[PDB]
């Protein structure tokens, strides 16, 4: 597969056709890389495996020699990068002692993955450095990575710090401690100590909550940098304290203890970024102190906190913001003091159009404001920010809107007075009437506001729903779906207040849009109908179901991901609840239409589908519909079938399977194999759902499992084995064990194979058989296999014997046989032979 015009430089050796005459042939055959980089997806797959199994063969040297240039390529893609990352992982699951010379030679390319805009790139990078460090040795990593500490560029120092974070997560803090503790005391130059401290931080972020045990030692390291003559070291130091305390869940306060007294002092004398950093640290600290000591100390911090609102620094504003959250979100702080001193400057400087356009500042601002509401109360905050709902820009409106949302979510709408409530509803409608983008914030916002107001909202309905219909035209593509969803979430409120005319409106009006050709709208429409069904009942539906349901029936062709979803859902609600209003003929047509809905690429679609199919199975009764399931061609191998199997299960539940089984068991006869294993699955899920009731049917299924478990082809043994499992859990304790032993006979030979699905299947099988039969019989099959020095039987029988061993280890005692004692050892336990 083709070569980009640049990649020639790398792959030129492949171009020449000289062939068939040692190492040069290994580099030459190693161009399978090219097949991984560019080509068809299958070529990438097969190539990837082929190079995985050749790891031990080719060795890490030639590979990395032929890779690292590519992953270093200036023209590298996104995908190609990620794929080469994959091959590096998969080969590094194998090679262990081999990589030692290349470790640095790896990290140099990989460390740039840690600092990246892409998140998935970062989690990948952390993963592969974890695999590398754990793969190599500790001393390998340490002795490797020293010279990058004092490197002139700070880039490598930084990304190297995150590297030490990852490797420290791998091999644990205490192993790597003396290295660090040695580093931060290095007397050569400051840059080192700066690095090592940054390492402390990135360890704090990465490990997070798990820092807890070594917190003391870590602090004892870092403390000496706060007083250092250099500035950076001080700044990054206190920052690292911050990260610690933030991962320091409400405890280890005294471990930070000796750190405080300098910090507070510094709080006085500092100008610039370092100051803000200290404020960050102290900020995360205060929640960890005692409300008495933290009373004083807090009251001291509040002053500077006030004074420093006004700085243009955005780092500043972030810090002091989150600070205000923690300091003023303290239970030991008085409302009125905040109400006077803080709120007016807070809404003055902080609420502006510089903030909201940014992302982090947006969020953090939301949170802090939410908490201030949590203390001073509701009507204050909201009352001050309502007037901004009507502000021009979107993002700002979005901000105050979600703020109001969370506020009225927590505190409740009860505190709100009347006039401010008028400004509320008008604000929310007005903001909702202009929507540049589609998003939930405005909608969830409105819904939460109304559901919180309760029936105080009643005078406002006609304005609401007037807007709802007029908007319900305007633009279908953009706003139809949105006004529809608005109805959906406002259903219950439009119900409990007992406005019936409005339910007539929404009922037939929405009924009319079911002919809408745009799917993304229609979906929202059906959703709205759904929500309306859950408030007003069956027989009171203003569009009587006789009208509605057959009008729904043809829509199932619609392909669309949202239409199919909501549609099938609603057919489910009505098919489950009333179900009498519609004649059976319509129903069976619904069936023959439902059958091909199982091509859905989405799992929830199939979910609702099968459950519905059960409901209508109740509405009619088993035989016909289970026959219509058995009609299935099985045509698709990758699933698309076994959902029908699930329908066979649930159908067998909805009316007693005590009826249904003979039809199925007969339908195993058919020579077509894939449907044979199909009905095997049907038995599996069947027993999984029936549980206890299998105390009878075990016998019926027993000989057929004999026929199936006796192998035509592996899938028979597998699926049948799964059946044995779920049967074995289900029947437990009821006294049927005998036939389960018989079936265990035929289960037992299948123990040996390398196919993952059949071996894990058999494992589940013998586990369920363990609990059902009891360990004694198991162990009596597992004894002789232990001994076997043959590199197979011992592997397996010891795997089994372990599975039997972990559970029920208490009950095994009696069943260990008598084993005679040799020369040096006494192998007879004589306690059991004490006789009265």
């Amino acid at each position: 597969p083709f070569l980009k015009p640049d990649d020639i430089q790398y792959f030129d050796k492949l171009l020449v056709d000289v062939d068939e005459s040692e190492e040069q042939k290994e580099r030459k055959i190693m161009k399978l890389l090219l097949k991984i980089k560019n080509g068809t997806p299958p070529m990438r797959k097969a190539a990837l495996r082929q190079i995985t199994d050749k790891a031990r063969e080719f060795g890490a040297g030639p590979l990395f020699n032929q890779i690292l240039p590519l992953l270093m390529s200036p023209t590298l893609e996104d995908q190609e990068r990620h794929l080469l990352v994959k091959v590096i992982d998969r080969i590094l699951y194998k090679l262990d002692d081999l990589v030692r010379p290349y470790v640095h030679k790896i990290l140099v390319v990989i460390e740039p993955l840690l600092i990246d805009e892409d998140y998935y790139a970062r989690v990948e990078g952390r993963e592969i450095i974890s695999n590398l460090a754990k793969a190599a040795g500790l001393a390998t990593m340490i002795s490797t990575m020293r010279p990058d500490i004092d490197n002139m560029d700070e880039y490598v120092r930084n990304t190297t710090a995150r590297a030490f974070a990852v490797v420290a997560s791998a091999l644990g803090i205490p192993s790597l401690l003396p290295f660090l503790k040695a580093v931060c005391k290095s007397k050569k130059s400051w840059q080192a100590r700066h690095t090592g401290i940054k390492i402390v931080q990135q360890i704090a972020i990465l490990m997070g909550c798990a820092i807890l045990p070594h917190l003391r030692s870590l602090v004892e390291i870092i403390e000496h940098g706060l007083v250092d003559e250099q500035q950076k070291v001080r700044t990054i130091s206190a920052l690292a304290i911050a990260a610690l305390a933030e991962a320091a869940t409400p405890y280890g306060i005294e471990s930070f203890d000796s750190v405080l007294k300098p910090l507070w002092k510094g709080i006085r004398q500092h100008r610039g970024k370092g100051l803000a950093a200290f404020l960050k640290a102290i900020g995360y600290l205060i929640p960890l102190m005692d409300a008495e000591y933290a009373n004083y100390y807090t009251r001291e911090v509040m002053l500077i906190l006030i004074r420093e609102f006004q700085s243009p620094d955005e780092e500043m504003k972030k810090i002091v913001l989150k600070v205000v959250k923690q300091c003023c979100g303290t239970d030991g702080v008085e409302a009125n003091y905040i109400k006077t001193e803080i709120l007016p400057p807070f809404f003055k400087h902080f609420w502006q159009h510089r903030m909201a356009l940014d992302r982090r500042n947006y969020r953090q601002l939301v949170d802090t404001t939410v908490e201030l509401a949590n203390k001073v109360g509701a009507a204050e905050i909201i009352s001050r920010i309502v007037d901004d709902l009507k502000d021009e820009a979107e993002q700002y409106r979005k901000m105050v809107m979600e703020t109001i949302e969370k506020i009225m979510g927590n505190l409740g709408a009860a505190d709100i007075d009347h006039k401010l409530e008028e400004q509320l509803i008008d604000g929310i409608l007005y903001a909702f009437q202009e929507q540049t983008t589609e998003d939930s914030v405005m909608l969830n916002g409105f819904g939460t506001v109304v559901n919180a107001l309760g029936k105080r909202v009643k005078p406002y309905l006609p304005q609401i729903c007037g807007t709802v219909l007029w908007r319900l035209n305007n633009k279908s593509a953009k706003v139809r779906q949105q006004a529809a969803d608005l109805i959906s979430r406002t259903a219950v409120v439009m119900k409990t207040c007992q406005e019936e005319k409005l339910m007539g409106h929404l009922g037939v009006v929405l009924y009319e849009y079911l002919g809408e050709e745009y799917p993304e709208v229609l979906g929202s429409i059906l959703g709205a109908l759904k929500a309306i069904v859950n408030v007003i009942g069956m027989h009171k539906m203003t569009p009587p179901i006789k009208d509605l349901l057959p009008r729904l029936t043809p829509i199932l062709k619609n392909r669309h991901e949202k239409v199919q979803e909501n549609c099938i859902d609603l057919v489910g609600r009505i098919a489950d609840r009333g179900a009498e209003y519609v004649s059976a003929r319509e129903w069976m047509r619904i069936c023959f239409e439902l059958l091909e809905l199982l091509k859905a690429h989405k799992k929830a679609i199939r979910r609702a589908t099968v459950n519905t199919f059960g409901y209508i199975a109740k509405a009619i009764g088993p035989h016909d519909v289970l026959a219509t399931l058995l009609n299935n061609l099985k045509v698709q191998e990758r699933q698309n079938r076994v959902c029908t199997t699930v329908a066979i299960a649930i159908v067998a539940e909805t009316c007693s399977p005590f009826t249904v089984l003979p039809a199925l068991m007969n339908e195993y006869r058919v020579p077509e194999l894939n449907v044979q294993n199909g009905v095997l699955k049907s038995l599996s899920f069947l027993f999984e759902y029936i549980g206890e009731m299998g105390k009878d049917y075990i016998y019926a299924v027993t000989p057929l499992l004999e026929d199936a478990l006796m192998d035509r082809d592996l899938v028979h043994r597998q699926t049948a084995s799964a059946v044995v499992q779920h049967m074995s859990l289900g029947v437990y304790g009821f006294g049927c064990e005998d036939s389960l032993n018989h079936l265990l006979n035929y289960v037992w030979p299948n123990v040996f194979e390398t196919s993952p699905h059949v071996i894990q299947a058999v494992m589940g099988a013998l586990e369920g058989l363990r609990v059902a039969i009891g360990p004694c019989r198991m162990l009596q099959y597992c004894l002789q296999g232990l001994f076997h020095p043959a590199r197979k039987v011992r592997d397996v029988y010891w795997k089994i014997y372990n599975s039997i061993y972990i559970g029920s280890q208490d009950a095994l005692i009696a069943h260990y046989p008598r084993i005679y004692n040799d020369d040096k050892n006494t192998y007879i336990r004589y306690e059991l032979d004490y006789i009265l």
Binding site: G208, E688, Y689, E767
Partner: protein, 100 residues
């Protein structure tokens, strides 16, 4: 599980944080990965639920809405008395789908 075989669980110490399930993974079991017979609720680890890691799904890892529960077949097989089955690793799933 049956969908992702290369995924590894957390298996950490059990805390007092009750587990939750996302709206896309609602009703699915954690160990048995089934939809019927819920018998025991899911408990999360202490490090697995802290700050932004609280209120997240165990299997899906997205925004959790409803509380997750374990299957009765996994409860009778003593598969629910193990550690916290939080999905930590995420490999060969939702990686190439972001590019398309």
């Amino acid at each position: 599980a049956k969908h992702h075989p290369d995924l590894i669980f957390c298996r950490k110490q059990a805390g007092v944080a009750i587990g939750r399930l996302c709206e896309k993974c609602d009703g699915k079991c954690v160990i048995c990965d089934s939809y019927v017979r819920p018998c025991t609720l899911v408990r999360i680890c202490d490090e697995c639920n802290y700050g932004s890691y609280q209120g997240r799904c165990v299997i899906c890892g997205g925004p959790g809405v409803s509380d997750a529960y374990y299957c009765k077949e996994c409860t009778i097989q003593e598969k629910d008395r193990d550690g916290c089955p939080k999905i930590v690793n995420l490999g060969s799933s939702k990686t190439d789908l972001f590019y398309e």
